[PDB]
Every structure is written in C-alpha cells, then in structure tokens.
Amino acid sequence: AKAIKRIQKIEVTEEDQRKRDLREIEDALIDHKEAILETLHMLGHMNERGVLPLLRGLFGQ
Amino acid sequence: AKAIKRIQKIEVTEEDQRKRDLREIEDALIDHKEAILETLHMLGHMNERGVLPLLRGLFGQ
Amino acid sequence: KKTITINGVEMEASEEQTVLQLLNNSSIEVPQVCYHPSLGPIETCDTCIVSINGELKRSCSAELKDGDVIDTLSPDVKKAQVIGMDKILYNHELYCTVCDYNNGGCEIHNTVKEMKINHQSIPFDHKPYHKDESHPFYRYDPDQCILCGRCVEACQDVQVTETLTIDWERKRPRVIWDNDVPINESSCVSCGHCSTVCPCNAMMEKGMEGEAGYLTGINNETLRPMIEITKGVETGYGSILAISDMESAMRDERIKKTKTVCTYCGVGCSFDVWTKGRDILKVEPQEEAPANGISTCVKGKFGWDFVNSEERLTKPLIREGDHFREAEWEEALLLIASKFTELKEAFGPDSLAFITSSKCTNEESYLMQKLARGVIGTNNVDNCSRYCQSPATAGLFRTVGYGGDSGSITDIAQADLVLIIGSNTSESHPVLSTRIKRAHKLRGQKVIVADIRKHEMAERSDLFVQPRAGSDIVWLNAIAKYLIENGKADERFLRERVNGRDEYVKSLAPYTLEYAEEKTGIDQETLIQMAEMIGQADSVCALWAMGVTQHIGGSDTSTAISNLLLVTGNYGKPGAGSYPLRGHNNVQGASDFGSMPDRLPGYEKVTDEQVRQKYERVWGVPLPKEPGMTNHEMIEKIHSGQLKAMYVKGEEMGLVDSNINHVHAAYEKLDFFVVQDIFLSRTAEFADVVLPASPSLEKEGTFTNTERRIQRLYQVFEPLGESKPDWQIIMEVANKLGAGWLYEHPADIMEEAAKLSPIYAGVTYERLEGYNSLQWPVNADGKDSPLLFTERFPFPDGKAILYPVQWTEPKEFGEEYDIHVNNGRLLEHFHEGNLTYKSKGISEKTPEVFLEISPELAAERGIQDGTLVRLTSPFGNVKVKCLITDRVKGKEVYLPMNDSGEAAINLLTGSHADKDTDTPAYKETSAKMEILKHDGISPLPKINHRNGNPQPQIGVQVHKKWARKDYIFPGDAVK
Ligand SMILES: Nc1nc2c(c(=O)[nH]1)N[C@H]1C(S)=C(S)[C@@H](COP(=O)(O)OP(=O)(O)OC[C@H]3O[C@@H](n4cnc5c(=O)[nH]c(N)nc54)[C@H](O)[C@@H]3O)O[C@H]1N2
Ligand SMILES: Nc1nc2c(c(=O)[nH]1)N[C@H]1C(S)=C(S)[C@@H](COP(=O)(O)OP(=O)(O)OC[C@H]3O[C@@H](n4cnc5c(=O)[nH]c(N)nc54)[C@H](O)[C@@H]3O)O[C@H]1N2
Ligand SMILES: CCCCCCCCCCCCCC(=O)O
Ligand SMILES: CCCCCCCCCCCCCC(=O)O
Ligand code: SF4
Ligand code: SF4
Numbered sequence A, B: 001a002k003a004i005k006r007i008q009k010i011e012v013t014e015e016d017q018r019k020r021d022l023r024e025i026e027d028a029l030i031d032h033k034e035a036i037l038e039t040l041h042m043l044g045h046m047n048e049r050g051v052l053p054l055l056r057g058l059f060g061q
Numbered sequence C: 001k002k003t004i005t006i007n008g009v010e011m012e013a014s015e016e017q018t019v020l021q022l023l024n025n026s027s028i029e030v031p032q033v034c035y036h037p038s039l040g041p042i043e044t045c046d047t048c049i050v051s052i053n054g055e056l057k058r059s060c061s062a063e064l065k066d067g068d069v070i071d072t073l074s075p076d077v078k079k080a081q082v083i084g085m086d087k088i089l090y091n092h093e094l095y096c097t098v099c100d101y102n103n104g105g106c107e108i109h110n111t112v113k114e115m116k117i118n119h120q121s122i123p124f125d126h127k128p129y130h131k132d133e134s135h136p137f138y139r140y141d142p143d144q145c146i147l148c149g150r151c152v153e154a155c156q157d158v159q160v161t162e163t164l165t166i167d168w169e170r171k172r173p174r175v176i177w178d179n180d181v182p183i184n185e186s187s188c189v190s191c192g193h194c195s196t197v198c199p200c201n202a203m204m205e206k207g208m209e210g211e212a213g214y215l216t217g218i219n220n221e222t223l224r225p226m227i228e229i230t231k232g233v234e235t236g237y238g239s240i241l242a243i244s245d246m247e248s249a250m251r252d253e254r255i256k257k258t259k260t261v262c263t264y265c266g267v268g269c270s271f272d273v274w275t276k277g278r279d280i281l282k283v284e285p286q287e288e289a290p291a292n293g294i295s296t297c298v299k300g301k302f303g304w305d306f307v308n309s310e311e312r313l314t315k316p317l318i319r320e321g322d323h324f325r326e327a328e329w330e331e332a333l334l335l336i337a338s339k340f341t342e343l344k345e346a347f348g349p350d351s352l353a354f355i356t357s358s359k360c361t362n363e364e365s366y367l368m369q370k371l372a373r374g375v376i377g378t379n380n381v382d383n384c385s386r387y388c389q390s391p392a393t394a395g396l397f398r399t400v401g402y403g404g405d406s407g408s409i410t411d412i413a414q415a416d417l418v419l420i421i422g423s424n425t426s427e428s429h430p431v432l433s434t435r436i437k438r439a440h441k442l443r444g445q446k447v448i449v450a451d452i453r454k455h456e457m458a459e460r461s462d463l464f465v466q467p468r469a470g471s472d473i474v475w476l477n478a479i480a481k482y483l484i485e486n487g488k489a490d491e492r493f494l495r496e497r498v499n500g501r502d503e504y505v506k507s508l509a510p511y512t513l514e515y516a517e518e519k520t521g522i523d524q525e526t527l528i529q530m531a532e533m534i535g536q537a538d539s540v541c542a543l544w545a546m547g548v549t550q551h552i553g554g555s556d557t558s559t560a561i562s563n564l565l566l567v568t569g570n571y572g573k574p575g576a577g578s579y580p581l582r583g584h585n586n587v588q589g590a591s592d593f594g595s596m597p598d599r600l601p602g603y604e605k606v607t608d609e610q611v612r613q614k615y616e617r618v619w620g621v622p623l624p625k626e627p628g629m630t631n632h633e634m635i636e637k638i639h640s641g642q643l644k645a646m647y648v649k650g651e652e653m654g655l656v657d658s659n660i661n662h663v664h665a666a667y668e669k670l671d672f673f674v675v676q677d678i679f680l681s682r683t684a685e686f687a688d689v690v691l692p693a694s695p696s697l698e699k700e701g702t703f704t705n706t707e708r709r710i711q712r713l714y715q716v717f718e719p720l721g722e723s724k725p726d727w728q729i730i731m732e733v734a735n736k737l738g739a740g741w742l743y744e745h746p747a748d749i750m751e752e753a754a755k756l757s758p759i760y761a762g763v764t765y766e767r768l769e770g771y772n773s774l775q776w777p778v779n780a781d782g783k784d785s786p787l788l789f790t791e792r793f794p795f796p797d798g799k800a801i802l803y804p805v806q807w808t809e810p811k812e813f814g815e816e817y818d819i820h821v822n823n824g825r826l827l828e829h830f831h832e833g834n835l836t837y838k839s840k841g842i843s844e845k846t847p848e849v850f851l852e853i854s855p856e857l858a859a860e861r862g863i864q865d866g867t868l869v870r871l872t873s874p875f876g877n878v879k880v881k882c883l884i885t886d887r888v889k890g891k892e893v894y895l896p897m898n899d900s901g902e903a904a905i906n907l908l909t910g911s912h913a914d915k916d917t918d919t920p921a922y923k924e925t926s927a928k929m930e931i932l933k934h935d936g937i938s939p940l941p942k943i944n945h946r947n948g949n950p951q952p953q954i955g956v957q958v959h960k961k962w963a964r965k966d967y968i969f970p971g972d973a974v975k
C-alpha cells in the first residue's frame, strides 16, 4: 500500500492503567507470598508478646 | 474396568491460581488481624508524634 | 624439551614461551597488573618481579630457558613486587566501595588484595590534568591512570588505530590521544578496546559511571569528602577492601551479565552485556569469545541504544486508511491468516513471497521458510544475501562446493599474503581487519589491496592497485594466465585436486598483460608484482566483498578469485583460502537455513526430489517442487500482477533494493504487505500490517558468522511491550493457518532443523553453551570443521573444478552521466542507520550522509565542504552536501548508505543486476552532478574520526619510561 507514518495509539484509560499497576503489585505479593506470610506470623507474635502494644503506647503517649 | 495409567489433570488457569494465592495472603491477614490493627494504631501515633514525617523528610532530602 | 625448577620443585615445561606463562599454568601466585594475554608483555607495571637464577627479573618478558631456577616466594622477590605496586598506587587512588570498577574483576583491586597489602608507601598524588570527558561513549581519568600502557598496546598493536600513546617524555606522564588532543576531536574510532583492556577505572565507559555501584550515585560533591574522610580514618587496606568486597558481591543483585552475539556485521563478535534493569552499562568482551576475543568496534561496543529507543514498536499496527491503527495481536494475526488464505485460494500459493532477515537468528530463518514452503506452499523465500554474496557463494559452489569461507579469522591472521578485492575491511569487518592490520604491522604479512577508494586497508597495504570499476575479473584472469604460463602455478595441487584445467587455460587466452593494462588501468609492471607476491606467498587468503559482487559479472569475478586460489594451491591448508566477507551478523546463517528460493537448509537443492521427500516426511506435508523468486525479482512480479503478498521481516527493502522509485511504485500496487520490524522503517510505511518484533537482546537463538561459526545468544532483556521475538511471531502466524507447531524455545526449532540439514547434523544447544561454538559442516558426532577442504573438496570425485569465466563489461549509463557514484558503508553506521541513528553518541560524531568529492572534481566544479549538489541518474535523484577528500579520485564520488530520504543512494541505482544470481549491481551506478547551493556547513564534524591525526608506533615505548631519571627498577632496590 501507499506510504503512511501517522499512528493512532490504543486508548489506555486512567482506570485501565490503575488496574495494570495494582495487578503488578498483586503479582509481586503473590511472588513474595511466603515472605509476607512469614512476616505476618512474626508480627502476630510481636503482638502476643509485649512488643507491638508497648510500641503503640510508647508513640501514643 | 481395563488397566489405564494416563491422567488428564484439571485445568488450573493463571487467573484461578492468582485468586488462590491472593486468598491465601488474605487468610494470613485475617489470622493476624489483631497484630495488623495494632501495627496500624502504632503507625498512626508515629505520624501524630511527627516521627513518620521526620523520616519522610530525612530520606526525601 | 625444557625442564625447570620453580620454588624448589622441578617440572617439565610444555610450549610456555615465558616464565610468567608457565607460572600461570602451574597456578603459582605472581602479580601481573599490566599483563593481558591478548596484548602480550608490556613491562610497565613491574609487579611480576621473580628471581630467574638469582637475578630479579620481570617474568612476563623473561624467556623460559632450559634449566632455569625461578623463585617466586623469597623475601627479596616479594619486597620487589610491593615496590612496583607502590608506584601503581601512587598513580591510582583506591576508593573501591564507591568505584564503578569494583565488580570483582578489577586487576588493581584484586592485586592489592592478593598481595596482603595494608599500607601504601608512596601517597596518592593527583596528576596535573583534568578528566577528558569529551567523547560520547568513554572517558579518561588521568588521576586513576597507572601508565600500564595496556590501552596503548590495544590501540596500536591490536586494534591498529594508533591514536593512543603515553607521553613518557613529560614531567608527569599520561595517555595522550593523537598529539595530546581531546578524545572527541582525535582519530579515536570509538572501538572500545582501551576501556576493555584498562585494568582499573582510569579508562571507563560513561555507561558505568554512577550506575554499577550502590554508593556511586552519590554526587561527586558529597562523594569526594566521603573518600577523603575514609582515607584519613583507614586502619588498613584489608579492612576497607573487605567492606568493598561485600558491596561488590551485592552488585550481583542489580547488574545482570549476559552473553550475546553482535547484531551488526558478519565478524561475529560475542561479548557480555552488563545491564542494570533496562540500562546497558557496558558491553564487556571476554577472552573466550571465539571470533573476536576482547576486540569490538563502535557498533558492538557502544551502538546498542536502539534497543531502548522511544521509537521501538511495542504494538501491532493495522492500516486504517491514511494512518496506522494500534491493534491487538489477535486481530493482526487473524487478519494476516485471513488475507494470506484468501490470496492462496484465489491466486495460488506462489502469489505470496517471504523475506527472511539476516539480522534475525538461524531458527527464525528456518521458520520463515517452513511457513513459505510447508504452510503456504510456495518456494518464494529469500534474504538480503541476494543483494550481497549470492555471486560469492555462486563462485564457491562452481569451484569448491561449499557456500562459505574457507577457514577462520585465525587463518587470516596467519596468512603470508592477504589479497583484499573490493572490500572496505576495517569499516565493514572491523574486528576481522584488526587481525590483518596486526599481522601486517607486526608479523610482516603482505597485504595487497585492489580498490577504487583509498580506505584504511588501502592506506596500510603493501601494494595498493586501483582498477577501473568492474574490471576486476580482467586482472584476476591475467594473474592466473601469467602464473600458469611462467610455470609458477602449484602444479602438484592442480594435478590431484583440480578438474577442468585445459578448458580453464583456453578461457584465459584474451587476458594478457597488455589487455589487463588496457582494461583495468593497472600497468603491466605492477601486475607482475601482484602475480609474484601472490605466487611466492606460501599461504594466501583472498578476501572479497561488495566491490566485487555488486556487479553484472559479480558471480564470474568471484569465480575468478576461487580459480586463482586453485592455481596457486591456496586451499585445504591453514593460512589460505577464499574469504567472501559475510555481510550481516547472520547472513551466513539465514542462507544456511534455507532462506533462498532455490535451496532448502544446508544448501540442499529444492528441485532435488530426494531432499524434498525427506522434508515431506518430517514436516508432514508436500513441498513445492518449483523454485521461487529472488528478493530483487519480487518487485518485478508485483508490477506484473503475479505477486499479491509480501511478508518482509527485518529488511529495509524500501531503501536497500536498487531503484527505490520502482520499488516504492511496486509497493503501492501490492495487495497485502506485512512488515515485521523493531521500528517503523521506510518499508513499514508501505505495509498494511506492521508486527512489532524484538531485537537480538530481547531473544534467544543462534547466529552463524563469516567463519561458518554457529554461536548461541542469550536473552538480555525481556521483549519490550507487546513486541515478540521473530520466531514467536512466525510460529504464531503459521499456527493461525493450522500449522500446529509447538516450539517453546529456539532450541526446539534447532533440534528439528539439525536432523534435516546435513551440514548442521551435530549442532545442539549443549555444544554451543556459553562461549562455545561450532563451525559447519558439523557431523552428528559433534566434530566441527574449522578449516574446509583439508581432506577433499565436496564433489563426487573429491576434486575442485576450475570454472571458465568471462569479463562482463559493467553497465554504461550514457555520456551525459559523467560521475561514477561509488557507494558503501561507514565504520560507525549500519546501512541507512535504522539502528545506529538511534545511538546518540554515533550520531554526535557522524550526524549525516555526505558525498565524497575528489580535490580534482572539487576544483573543476567549484565545490567546497557543505556544497549541496544534485546527482541525477535515469532512475531518480539525490540532493546531498559535499565532502572533499583524497580517498576518492577524479570523477568517481562516494556516497555512503547512511540516509533515509533526499540522499538515499538507491534513488540513483538501477534495476540492473548480476546475470547469474540477480544481485543488484550497486557498484555500477553513474549520474550527472548539478550544483544547488554553494555555502553550507560541512556534513562531517571536526569530532569525526576521519578528521584525526594518528601517531603510529610499535608498542608502548616502555624504553622511554626507563630512560627517565625518576625510573628505578623495583628489582634494583637491593642496596
Ligand atoms: N560499519 C558497517 N559494517 C558493515 C555494514 C554496515 O552497514 N556498516 N554492512 C554489512 C553488510 S550487509 C555488508 S554486505 C558487508 C560488506 O561490506 P564491504 O563490501 O566491505 O563494504 P562497502 O563499502 O559497501 O564495499 C565497497 C568497497 O569496494 C570498493 N569498490 C567499489 N567498486 C569496486 C570495483 O569495481 N572494484 C574494486 N576492487 N573495489 C570496488 C569501494 O570503493 C569500497 O571500498 O559489510 C557489513 N559490515
Ligand atoms: N546502493 C547500495 N544499496 C545496497 C547496498 C550497497 O552496498 N549499496 N548493500 C546491499 C546489501 S549487501 C545488503 S545486505 C542490504 C542491507 O539492507 P537490510 O538487510 O534491509 O539492512 P539494514 O538497513 O540493517 O535493515 C535491517 C532492518 O531490520 C530491522 N531489525 C534489526 N533487528 C531486528 C530483529 O531482531 N527483528 C526484526 N524483525 N527486524 C530487526 C532494523 O530496524 C532495520 O529496519 O543493503 C543493500 N543495498
Ligand atoms: C516492611 C514490609 C512492607 C510490605 C508492604 C506491603 C504492601 C502491601 C500492598 C497491598 C496491595 C493490595 C493490592 C490491591 O488492593 O489491589
Ligand atoms: C512489616 C509488616 C509488613 C506487613 C505486610 C502486609 C502485606 C499486606 C498485603 C495486602 C494483601 C491484599 C490482598 C489482596 O489485594 O487481595
Ligand atoms: S579501579 Fe579497582 S582498585 Fe581502583 S578504586 Fe575502582 S575497584 Fe578500587
Ligand atoms: S580507537 Fe579509540 S576507543 Fe579504540 S582503542 Fe583507540 S583510543 Fe581506544
């Protein structure tokens, strides 16, 4: 066909890009699932032990 | 019936596995709900006390 | 034969020419800051001080004699090594934790570490010079320079550019570019050699600056006091060297180092790409690289900017009237399947042509032809070898039977004589030419250059003859006639290994010295010298390129070169052979995998019913029996309503086919046009569908270079956006047509193809892992063929064939066209510059095309640098600025290909092609020149390498350093 240069780009809406970015963060959590799960267990123990409430009170007051 | 060995596995799609993995992370948050809630309260106080803004500025500048 | 005793223990010496070479093989600790195996000994660092028979001597230069008592452990030898290191440390500041060269491979760093050094006797004193950061690609930091001369050895004796020298005669020596000019304004060709061989950060790539380290991003304003604080605090070198080692280890998280094969020319340079995310930090050459070693040119070392160009196509484009619509991959593939099936049903399978890219991999060439023959059902396949070495392979097929070079680049560097015909070897095959230049400069290799333009090879040649364009076969036939008749031909070789001798001598009848002098213009006396040099040389490598083949008699002139080599007995032995230099990075491999209308992979003829039947059983479908169209012929068949579709991958046909006005006219007529490329090329503008392809760095696969050397490339980056690697695209197009191909990696494509192609039978990805390579023919046992025709020639009787060839007069354009427009490439630019214009650094020193006018023609037409002229031929016209230089003579001008519009050389060229291979005769272009503007800025800036002033010399001139008053040999520090 004849020579053309103009390209009409595909519309990536604000909401579409937001989903792509959030999905990228979701995939990173999925990849580091074990590390997150372990962090949550560790965090749960810090709360059971005196640690998290003590820090909440140290900054609270 | 006659002897067969071939097993036709059930299709776990990429999106199905993503939901399973995210749901596993959700369940861990639900289990450590109190610890997370306590961390958030402590974090809120760090911000009120101007500790988080100080750190934001220390790294920002 | 030699027996020595090192450190008390005695052991026999093998072929180790030096004491250091033996110590290294024996795994004995010895510092060697200035020793790099690719360069050889320099004797500048003075850290290899070992005691050869009680005498303290530099082991890198010390020759290993029989019965030598070498000691590398006594307190005096160690006290001498530390003294040599103290001078290195006085000229180099250690700041490793915040240095980009602290990547575990720094020779100063690891030597200070190996020597268990904790203090520095001579404090670091800054040199009285500023950093030379003028060049776009690399920079010089004189304060970090240890004056080892590794960069000087590389520039002078390895690269043979001769820009770098060390001003030893100065109060505080430093590396100088030309006669101490800024790097950017010097003759520095930007090859990268000096940065590669530098043992520290003294010469580094600007890509590495602030990127490699975790703390190197800290602005020099804050980082400088940090270094001064650390220097003062420092307890010992070993303490802060451990801190720097931990940080160096951490860099492995960020920096990714991946082996790849250069996407540019046929030299086949392989190297590691250092990438932090998507940023290319540096192209790090490796000694293990089979074709190049540590050698690179500006294109492979620094011309990779295009991979990250904002112009990279990331989405398929479907034409929607007067514009391109960005569309999903599914709709683009569905449309290609619907239209390809439509033209195949209504007009036949032969109404669809397919163009393979010699930029793409062997597997991608194989899949394009499997799509054309096995899926569409046509033999209309081809690649840019049509405009390139089709005449050279036709010549080799007629005489020696294999469509490739006779040997390796190592054989070229070994040759007694190198005959170069119509080949700008240092600009088109830079790393291959470094082997010839070094051999001529140091080993005394004879170099004969036959060319119409005085290029680097012509300037450095032992004999530079200038024959008239197209007359090359006339002098080639005359050299053979004189050598045969004067009894100087290798009659022993011709006897048992050659056929058609008497018919050959009958065809040489018209080519007498008088006829050659008359037609070529080379006098009879110099013709005698050429014949004597060729005949008396024990081993002769004949390297030819587009100066020979881009002609009407290009196939015949190529055959004449092979015939001459047969006569002089230069085949089947190391250091000799026919070397038609392969153009693209993978032109050899694209042809090797059947991207030719007449042949299937492994060069097995299409019309061969036995070959076709083999592929029918494996592919599960019948193959078309009749051959197809050539790349050039394809536009004629569109113009005659025979070709309704074209699938062109990675080929800029809209600018590289001859007579681009006729090619563009054909494009408007064409029913369906699919262009697959990494950018919206000139050709892609005429496409109905453009598919975003991924370049070499974004895919895996293999390339076959000029030496028939199959090399594997590893993926550096993941494919950008929705661009897919070419094999994945070709496979997805075929699958849309019901092919059902199930490849998962190019290695799957290679396994299928190795079984079918006999010359690739033993090729497996396992045999090509890392820097490993295989030269074809590779039998199923994995045994490759580095040197062809050692045992026999691949013909039924094992004998080569002398092929009768006639001179075909080059096409005459007419009396009105008095300018012979010679055309070619430039060292820095690759063709129209679709890849190299994206490189900002290359564009900075060569921003545009230019027309080389001789000082004679410039005087006659009143031309100055920048004069806009209009070359007009019977096919089109170009408007181009002028550049005066004695590189071009009389009425022959030179127009390089680096332009995509007004000055596109293929607007002048005609559709006339070689009579046997249809290779467009690009070196047979005439035109008339009309002045348009008189005053204009010169098209070649002051910073271009061609505006330099090299300082040729043998070595580093280390004797000048020893002649100084301040020089005291570390070994001499006894009393
Ligand atoms: N830097 C760079 N290197 C490249 C390329 C690139 O674009 N840039 N392209 C690659 C490709 S695809 C190609 S094919 C190869 C080949 O590359 P070469 O063939 O080495 O390159 P060109 O300069 O096109 O060759 C033309 C040379 O032959 C001379 N010449 C012209 N006509 C005649 C004639 O009739 N007789 C004689 N004796 N000499 C003649 C010209 O003056 C010039 O020296 O280079 C590859 N290497
Ligand atoms: N006047 C004149 N004309 C000539 C010549 C001459 O000497 N004089 N030389 C002739 C010869 S020898 C040759 S080989 C041709 C060179 O002509 P081509 O073979 O067309 O060469 P390049 O201009 O390098 O075009 C390469 C194209 O491939 C694209 N590309 C790069 N990497 C990839 C990849 O991985 N995948 C895909 N799909 N595309 C990619 C680039 O963006 C570019 O558009 O020129 C020919 N034309
Ligand atoms: C110190 C460890 C900090 C870990 C930060 C975790 C960030 C969690 C992001 C959660 C994103 C939710 C995804 C979504 O809402 O779509
Ligand atoms: C230092 C403590 C770090 C705690 C990390 C918390 C991670 C939060 C994960 C949030 C996941 C959201 C679930 C979802 O989007 O489906
Ligand atoms: S060049 Fe090597 S020795 Fe010098 S500061 Fe950098 S890492 Fe250390
Ligand atoms: S040409 Fe330039 S980059 Fe190459 S070795 Fe010489 S000075 Fe260094």
Ligand code: SF4
Residues within 6 Å of the ligand: C144, C145, C146, C147, C148, C149, C150, C151, C152, C175, C194, C197, C198, C199, C200, C202, C203
């Ligand atoms: S610039 Fe040259 S002399 Fe200086 S350290 Fe680097 S390679 Fe050695």
Ligand code: SF4
Residues within 6 Å of the ligand: C262, C263, C264, C265, C266, C267, C268, C269, C292, C295, C296, C297, C298, C299, C300, C301, C429, C430, C431, C432
């Ligand atoms: S000589 Fe060829 S393969 Fe080697 S770096 Fe230069 S362009 Fe790449």
Ligand code: FES
Residues within 6 Å of the ligand: C031, C032, C033, C034, C035, C042, C043, C044, C045, C046, C047, C048, C058, C059, C060, C061
């Ligand atoms: S390696 Fe011997 S003096 Fe440098």
Ligand SMILES: [Mo+4]
Residues within 6 Å of the ligand: C384, C385, C387, C388, C389, C583, C584, C587
């Ligand atoms: Mo080519």
Ligand code: NA
Residues within 6 Å of the ligand: C195, C196, C197, C198, C199, C200, C203
């Ligand atoms: Na280096």
Ligand SMILES: [S]
Residues within 6 Å of the ligand: C358, C384, C385, C388, C389, C582, C583, C584, C587
């Ligand atoms: S080529």
